[PDB]
Design an enzyme around this catalytic site. Structure first.
Site, mmCIF file in Angstrom:
data_model
loop_
_atom_site.group_PDB
_atom_site.id
_atom_site.type_symbol
_atom_site.label_atom_id
_atom_site.label_comp_id
_atom_site.label_asym_id
_atom_site.label_seq_id
_atom_site.Cartn_x
_atom_site.Cartn_y
_atom_site.Cartn_z
ATOM 1 N N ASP A 197 5.328 -7.166 7.201
ATOM 2 C CA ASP A 197 6.280 -7.735 6.254
ATOM 3 C C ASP A 197 5.876 -9.148 5.847
ATOM 4 O O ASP A 197 6.370 -9.685 4.856
ATOM 5 C CB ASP A 197 7.689 -7.741 6.850
ATOM 6 C CG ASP A 197 7.748 -8.426 8.201
ATOM 7 O OD1 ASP A 197 7.292 -9.584 8.303
ATOM 8 O OD2 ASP A 197 8.250 -7.805 9.162
ATOM 9 N N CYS A 229 4.838 -0.222 -4.141
ATOM 10 C CA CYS A 229 5.260 -0.903 -2.931
ATOM 11 C C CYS A 229 6.720 -1.288 -3.152
ATOM 12 O O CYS A 229 7.536 -0.441 -3.447
ATOM 13 C CB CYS A 229 4.303 -2.073 -2.599
ATOM 14 S SG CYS A 229 3.748 -3.213 -3.976
ATOM 15 N N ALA A 231 7.603 -4.588 -5.223
ATOM 16 C CA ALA A 231 7.455 -5.109 -6.610
ATOM 17 C C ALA A 231 6.498 -4.257 -7.485
ATOM 18 O O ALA A 231 6.649 -4.194 -8.727
ATOM 19 C CB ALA A 231 6.957 -6.583 -6.588
ATOM 20 N N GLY A 232 5.526 -3.621 -6.824
ATOM 21 C CA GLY A 232 4.532 -2.824 -7.484
ATOM 22 C C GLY A 232 3.388 -3.616 -8.065
ATOM 23 O O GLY A 232 2.828 -3.223 -9.068
ATOM 24 N N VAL A 233 3.032 -4.718 -7.402
ATOM 25 C CA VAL A 233 2.026 -5.646 -7.857
ATOM 26 C C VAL A 233 1.044 -6.086 -6.723
ATOM 27 O O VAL A 233 -0.129 -5.983 -6.883
ATOM 28 C CB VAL A 233 2.696 -6.880 -8.595
ATOM 29 C CG1 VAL A 233 3.272 -6.458 -9.915
ATOM 30 C CG2 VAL A 233 3.788 -7.571 -7.770
ATOM 31 N N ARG A 235 0.642 -5.462 -2.839
ATOM 32 C CA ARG A 235 0.065 -4.349 -2.049
ATOM 33 C C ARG A 235 -0.461 -3.261 -2.918
ATOM 34 O O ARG A 235 -1.512 -2.695 -2.624
ATOM 35 C CB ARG A 235 1.087 -3.762 -1.108
ATOM 36 C CG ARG A 235 1.683 -4.753 -0.137
ATOM 37 C CD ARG A 235 2.791 -4.114 0.634
ATOM 38 N NE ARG A 235 3.687 -5.083 1.273
ATOM 39 C CZ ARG A 235 4.584 -4.770 2.202
ATOM 40 N NH1 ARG A 235 4.681 -3.531 2.663
ATOM 41 N NH2 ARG A 235 5.363 -5.705 2.707
ATOM 42 N N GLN A 273 -1.428 -10.353 -5.676
ATOM 43 C CA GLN A 273 -0.321 -11.290 -5.837
ATOM 44 C C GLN A 273 -0.614 -12.614 -5.138
ATOM 45 O O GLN A 273 -0.195 -13.676 -5.599
ATOM 46 C CB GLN A 273 0.975 -10.685 -5.296
ATOM 47 C CG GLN A 273 2.199 -11.565 -5.491
ATOM 48 C CD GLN A 273 3.497 -10.820 -5.247
ATOM 49 O OE1 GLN A 273 3.567 -9.933 -4.397
ATOM 50 N NE2 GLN A 273 4.535 -11.180 -5.994
#
Length: 553
Positions: A197, A229, A231-233, A235, A273
């Site tokens: 995390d 994931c 946010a989708g950015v 990972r 990110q």
């Protein structure tokens, strides 16, 4: 852009001068689309506001996946993203919301997607990161798409879930059809379960294994692979770049992290990110180039073992296995029997109120399946039982001083007591015995009781039984573990080779059993990464090969 031979040297120069190269590069990635004035107006439309997980994380208009209109219904926070040698190889998207579950599955139907890569847990450190867009068991309805769970395969770091999805508003096709019913398709979700995390993964090996398996699962004439994931950015982009570069290396023997990453940032914002994620791409790809490949199928194991013993690939693997710890290191050195065998910082087993000489070790099914520790010292017996208690461990394997209670006197640890409830013995092949003692730990200020079984094993492995009899004791522990919870504590004197060998051979036999494949190097490398000095001689390593070989029959 960078031949793969220049990469060892390339990352060295990025790391050098206080990692100024990484910093510059990632700053270049951060600023490389500012001037392009890429819009995201549908993302920002008030009516689509509830369909975005985070206010700041948008889907650019030009590359956004569009849903077919229904009688702003076209909007989903998802973008097409290139791969290696393929346009629109991925849909990168946020962790879906309850309000967007329908849209998500509709987009998977509409795009002919067969693979989902999920690189998040649902809840991580008390925070909701993703809603559960799939049925826990059986079936669930998301608009016109019925999603059925067909199977679940659990590994230590990721879980594979096979789904059949059915679109009720789509025709069934012809009855003879070899492909089956045309309103049904298989979707396989490759769900990584061990991503911290905070920050990036400590070990690239299980991530590399996950990328490789999830990626090879892409079938021909299929739609984009969906990667999400929270946010989708971050990972998500990490995955896409290690995957794409894994495939570039294979094909050209070049690597192009910066140029490829700068490209895909035109496709979705905040790919990847953080600078630490950028560095991990590089670490992991370097780790990929240098570690060769070591997973070997059952029917190739004999031949593989033959050629790694001829000058030798066994020797070169073992130097990588033995390349391998701050608190140990210590005001804690009188708690260590031998401070050449101590836990790493990351794998250290903490006592709730600090130090015990014990390491978490991975199994086949779970990370933290085992704790490898040392034989308790008399001044370390309270700490040992505090570990059992704190981790709710129900199995202790001792591989040869009594640190356990007798019937006369219970053991008092402030928070709980240890009490023997029965002694017993199991028998083995050469008239050898395992001595069993059953303890209960009862809380002193609560009513919880923990049942703990203790195995005193004979000398193991037995050098004058067939090598295949090594697994008899392993199979006895496996069968006990099935009925109990928590970790399995394994100790010899120092928490060294015998302890490690029980863990390694358990893992690798569950792998051979479940996959008809074995990856000795990875299992052995991870044990040593989590506890330095478990495997120190090349003959111990060779014995893992020889032993696994005796099961291939």
């Amino acid at each position: 852009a960078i031949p793969v031979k220049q990469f060892v040297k390339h990352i060295g120069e990025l790391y050098s001068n206080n990692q100024h190269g990484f910093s510059e590069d990632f700053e270049e990635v951060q600023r490389c689309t500012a001037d392009m004035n890429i819009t995201a107006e549908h993302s920002n439309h008030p009516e689509n506001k509830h369909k975005n997980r985070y206010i700041n994380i948008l889907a650019y208009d030009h590359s956004r996946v569009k849903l077919r209109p229904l009688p702003h219904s076209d909007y989903i926070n998802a973008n097409y993203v290139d791969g290696y040698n393929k346009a629109k190889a991925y849909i990168a998207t946020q962790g879906p919301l309850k309000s967007t579950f329908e849209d998500f599955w509709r987009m998977i139907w509409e795009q002919n997607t067969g693979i989902i890569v999920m690189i998040t847990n649902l809840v991580e450190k008390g925070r909701r990161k993703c809603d559960q867009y799939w049925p826990t068991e059986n079936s669930e309805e998301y608009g016109n798409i019925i999603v059925t769970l067909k199977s679940t395969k659990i590994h230590a770091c990721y879980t594979v879930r096979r789904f059949s999805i059915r679109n009720t508003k789509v025709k069934k096709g012809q009855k003879g059809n070899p492909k089956g019913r045309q309103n049904e398709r298989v979707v396989i979700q490759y769900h990584y379960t061990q991503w911290p995390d905070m920050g990036v993964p400590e070990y690239a090996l299980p991530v590399l294994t996950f990328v490789r398996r999830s990626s090879a699962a892409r079938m021909p004439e299929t739609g984009p692979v969906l990667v999400h994931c929270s946010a989708g950015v971050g990972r998500t982009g990490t995955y896409i770049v290690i995957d794409s570069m894994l495939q570039q290396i294979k094909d050209k023997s070049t690597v192009n992290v910066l140029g490829f990453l700068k490209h895909i940032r035109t496709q979705r914002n905040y790919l990847v990110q953080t600078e630490e994620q950028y560095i991990f791409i590089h670490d992991a790809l370097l780790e990929a180039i240098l570690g060769k490949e070591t997973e070997v199928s059952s029917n190739q194991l004999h031949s593989y073992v033959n050629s790694i013993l001829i000058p030798t690939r066994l020797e070169k693997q073992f130097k990588l296995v033995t390349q391998c710890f701050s608190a140990q290191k210590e005001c804690n050195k009188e708690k260590n029997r031998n401070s050449s065998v101590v836990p790493s910082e990351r794998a250290r087993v903490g006592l709730a109120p600090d130090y015990i000489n014990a390491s978490y070790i991975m199994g086949y099914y779970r990370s933290n399946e085992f704790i490898i520790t040392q034989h308790p010292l008399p001044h370390t017996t309270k700490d040992f039982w505090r570990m059992i208690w704190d981790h709710n461990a129900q199995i202790i394997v001792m591989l040869p001083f009594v640190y356990w209670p007798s019937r006369e006197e219970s053991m008092n640890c402030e928070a709980f007591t240890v009490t023997l409830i029965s002694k017993d013995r199991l028998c083995l092949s050469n008239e050898e015995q395992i001595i069993i003692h059953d303890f209960i730990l009862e809380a002193t200020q609560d009513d919880y009781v923990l049942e703990v079984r203790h195995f005193q094993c004979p000398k193991w492995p037995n050098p004058d039984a067939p090598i295949s009899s090594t697994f008899e004791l392993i199979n006895v522990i496996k069968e006990e573990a099935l009925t109990r919870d928590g970790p399995t504590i394994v100790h010899d004197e120092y928490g060294a080779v015998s302890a490690g060998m029980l863990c390694a051979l358990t893992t690798l036999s569950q792998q051979l059993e479940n996959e008809n494949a074995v990856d000795v190097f990875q299992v052995a490398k991870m044990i040593n990464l989590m506890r330095p000095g478990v495997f120190t001689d090349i003959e111990q390593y060779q014995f893992i090969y020889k032993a696994m070989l005796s099961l291939v029959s």
